[PDB]
Amino acid sequence: PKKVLTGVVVSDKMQKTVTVLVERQFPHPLYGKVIKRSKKYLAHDPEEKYKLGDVVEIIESRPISKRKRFRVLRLVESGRMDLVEKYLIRRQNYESLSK
Amino acid sequence: RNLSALKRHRQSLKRRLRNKAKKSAIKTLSKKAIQLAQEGKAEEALKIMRKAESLIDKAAKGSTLHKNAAARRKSRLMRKVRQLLEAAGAPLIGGGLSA
């Protein structure tokens, strides 16, 4: 199984590359609540087909750059900009919390 | 003292020189063909180019290259020769190239 993941495209800034966001829920190892984490996958959009606020499948791949191991399989859904707004905000919140 | 795989070093030296030579030959020739291509003097470029190809496969025969090593060097060369042959190329010898 080359691994597939599903995520939301939260950054298109780069050339031929999209920042993809993939959530994982998993039961916590002691306390046993289900905790829901995530990471940004850096994923290879050759034709600049994919656009921000999409939702994609991402597939484990032959390496593209340092940091790109994954390319973009399909379009599961287009149009979740809410999700993007979440991420944009989490990072927006960073601007507090310092000095 | 005087452990006698001392001899091994002794040999490894000679081998060194032999590889180095063979490989220099290769380079100087390759570049020769390339310049010749830039110039678009087509048939000349080709005859060098074939000497180069051959000398490469020869280098391959032994421990200078082997492998895909040579094949890489060859594909690179030929591509570049042919590409370089458009400024009105009309590839005269066409010895090395599939028509």
Binding site: Y31, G32, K33, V34 | -
Partner: protein, 138 residues
């Protein structure tokens, strides 16, 4: 707002019994109704019915007690001596089939809600499935 409705049922029941009521209204839903069906079957409540209260529908859980008693404290034994939630929102719990619990060495139960439906401990074992471990009762 109400928050874990199933806890709130089991609780309405816990209180009701300790002050020895004949019955109580827990506001209703098919999942509670299923939890109850199992209670009745298992002998903890008398039974339950569907009622309406100022139009909005509930469930009368009719209650079981022991017989009256000797000396000071005539209050009869409880039938549900113990009732408690296990999985809760905010910590959910799931047993595999080989983890389903022996409650009070068997004299109590565990309501598991499974993909096969809501069943008791033994019921799930004999059925061979796992689930969300809802409460134990005894």
């Amino acid at each position: 707002m109400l928050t874990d409705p199933i806890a709130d049922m089991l609780t309405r029941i816990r209180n009701a019994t300790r002050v020895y009521k004949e019955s109580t209204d827990v506001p209703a839903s098919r999942f509670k109704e299923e939890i109850l069906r199992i209670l009745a079957r298992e002998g903890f409540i008398k039974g339950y019915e569907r009622v309406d209260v100022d139009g909005k529908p509930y469930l009368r859980v009719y209650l079981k007690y022991g017989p009256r008693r000797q000396g000071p404290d005539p209050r009869p034994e409880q039938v549900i001596h113990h009732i408690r939630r296990i999985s809760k929102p905010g910590r959910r719990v799931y047993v595999g089939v080989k983890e389903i619990p022996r409650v009070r060495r068997g004299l109590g139960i565990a309501i598991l809600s499974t993909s096969k439906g809501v069943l008791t401990d033994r019921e799930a074992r004999k059925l061979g499935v796992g689930g969300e471990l809802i409460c134990e009762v005894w």
